[PDB]
Design a protein around this ligand. Structure first.
Ligand SMILES: Nc1nc2c(c(=O)[nH]1)N[C@H]1C(S)=C(S)[C@@H](COP(=O)(O)O)O[C@H]1N2
Ligand SMILES: Nc1nc2c(c(=O)[nH]1)N[C@H]1C(S)=C(S)[C@@H](COP(=O)(O)O)O[C@H]1N2
Ligand code: MOM
Ligand code: MOM
Lengths: 353, 353
């Protein structure tokens, strides 16, 4: 009777926004504690019940107008294409939706600051699979690559998303058919046995439980948005301390994350303790990625003296390697879907006497 | 842990398309057996958990630019406005979606032919409530009336829908704030204590568990579609016999329903037994409504001789009082959302030897 009966167990203490389907984020106090988010804490966004996949009979279908159909086993995907490792942060379009909900009610799961997580993904390059199928580096005209999941709507339509053909074929874009996550088998909640990972691009495009790759001209495989969000803008949030905390006087360590879409590196994080009147530069920690390939977040921290009996409004904002900035307030960027919530994050705390 | 824990019990033997949220239709064999669908069989379409409403503290808010705020109790809605009774058929936008799914996979609950049901609704006229609030018969410019339900998205947004101001204020449009269904209290699944009923218009606009009525100019209250389907076209379906049935030779009684949007009366139902090559006119049964106020379906039947050992393809189509017709096939009207499935219904049966 329960369509979600076969869903996997999860780590206790996740912040669960929806049980069926399962949508949850790590608690903020753990989010910035490790550069790579442990698989058990990695935020989970499921539209549907989690597919149960027998690994030996699993086949990935690859097709398209000038290709020729492949039916690839998991063994074949592991052995016939060189394995690549890409460290990439996935962020939901609705990350920080609850801050937008606070201004005016929205539609969608009220994610806090934790609909974002980072892993080292291992797999075959989509580029290598598509070239093997007979697709060329370049096609005359505008084309896309569509991905279908094994999870399907009751009406029949599988979860699907697409990316431009140029991104799918680019050596530098690092698009993976990932079968490995942080050194181990892809967990069920994260797309076992195979997912697409599209670095620098909204999480929605990294299709889990992959069943079909299809090449198609721009104008069947359907992207669920039926323009559509691809790259995301600059994002940052304070994960320590937490809203409403009472902190002891003396030194305070403020920590958080920052990230930008499209492989743009975070080059600076500014932190304020007085609601954005004065700023100090945070120390950044990251993987120092190649130019235009900064797929992973920067974790940041700043240790600052705080005075007994005062009130703090901690604010952070980031700048990327193309010198993009964040908007300063939520109200002007508000939208009914509560997506693209990237205004300066503000956290109010009191300093104890 | 379960957001649907407080949902009401339902009649067993409904065709359940979704348990949580609850979406179900009566079985086809019972659908056309009564002109008024029993409350327990009336199709149910819920987006969310069913609100639990204590009736004495319930208040309906009525507001808008040139109105002045009302807070109406259930007692007040029953006593201060003349009660009207309107027999109206509600039909889901996705009625007969499964036939569209068969052509090509769609998104949405795969309703069969039963996402349609008819009741005699009792309540206050929306027109009378709005006039009482100080709204005039006519407003200069384009305006709408928005309805919000007590059921809200996790992001905060209540279920909502709107109708043009002209329809809300028209004496002939029969828009009701209904507190009565087929002579009894509105059941929980059908909007207890108060729902809007918008006759002649897609079911989505008849907002259940009503909390707010708001008048607003065309360009806050949000219609969930964020043009939007209002009136529906001609519809018909065969409910007896059922697909795949083996019927005895001799006489066969074919039965079904027909309906058209906007208060347009069904004036004819044609029935074929040979896939649409030859047709006979069915006998119609209905409430013989006033011109332009045919809110309720027509039930139809035809008794025809059938020959032992033959194969039948039973088809029906209807014509309304404005001489609108149904399209003949699903493929040309197919759409990803699987709505407006109104092609000629075809049912294959075998005649026994
Ligand atoms: N097949 C499938 N792929 C999917 C989804 C889904 O529901 N089904 N959710 C998408 C969305 S909206 C997001 S944000 C990411 C989340 O990936 P994660 O659950 O591994 O964090 O998966 C994407 N890929
Ligand atoms: N508040 C509220 N009203 C609502 C809905 C809902 O989910 N919430 N569903 C709508 C839709 S899409 C339909 S088809 C009808 C169905 O009404 P019924 O469940 O009484 O048949 O209710 C409409 N009114
Ligand atoms: O819905 Mo996804 O981009 O979290
Ligand atoms: O979704 Mo409604 O018009 O059944």
């Amino acid at each position: 009777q329960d369509p979600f009966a076969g869903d996997p167990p999860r780590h206790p203490g996740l912040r669960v926004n929806s049980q069926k389907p399962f949508n949850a984020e790590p608690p903020a106090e753990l989010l910035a504690e490790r550069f790579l988010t442990p698989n058990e804490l990695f935020f989970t966004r499921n539209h549907l019940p989690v597919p149960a996949v027998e690994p030996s009979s699993y086949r990935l279908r690859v097709d398209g107008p000038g290709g020729g159909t492949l039916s690839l086993s998991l063994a074949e995907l592991r052995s016939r294409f060189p394995k690549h490792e890409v460290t990439a942060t996935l962020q939901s379009a609705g990350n920080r939706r609850s801050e937008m909900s606070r201004v005016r009610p929205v539609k969608g799961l009220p994610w806090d600051i934790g609909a974002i997580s980072t892993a080292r993904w291992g797999g075959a390059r989509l580029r290598d699979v598509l070239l093997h199928a007979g697709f060329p580096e370049e096609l005359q005209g505008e084309w896309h690559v569509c991905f279908e999941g094994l999870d399907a709507d009751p009406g029949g339509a599988p979860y699907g998303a697409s990316i431009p053909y140029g991104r799918a074929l680019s050596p530098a874009a690092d698009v993976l058919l990932a079968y490995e996550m942080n050194g181990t088998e892809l967990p069920r909640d994260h797309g076992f046995p195979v997912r697409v990972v599209v670095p620098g691009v909204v999480g929605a495009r990294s299709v889990k439980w992959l069943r079909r790759v299809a090449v198609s001209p721009d104008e069947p495989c359907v992207d669920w948005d039926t323009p559509a969000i691809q790259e995301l803008p600059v994002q940052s949030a304070v994960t320590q301390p937490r809203p409403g905390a009472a902190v002891p006087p003396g030194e305070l360590t403020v920590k958080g994350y920052a990230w930008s879409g499209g492989g743009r590196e975070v080059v600076r994080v500014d932190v304020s303790l007085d609601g954005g009147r004065t700023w100090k530069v945070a120390r950044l920690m990251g993987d120092k990625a190649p130019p235009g390939r900064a797929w992973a977040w920067a974790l940041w921290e700043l240790t600052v003296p705080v005075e007994a009996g005062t009130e703090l409004e901690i604010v952070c904002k980031a700048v990327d390697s193309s010198y993009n900035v964040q908007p300063d307030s939520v109200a002007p960027i508000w939208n009914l879907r509560g997506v693209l919530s990237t205004a300066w994050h503000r956290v109010r705390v009191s300093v104890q006497d």
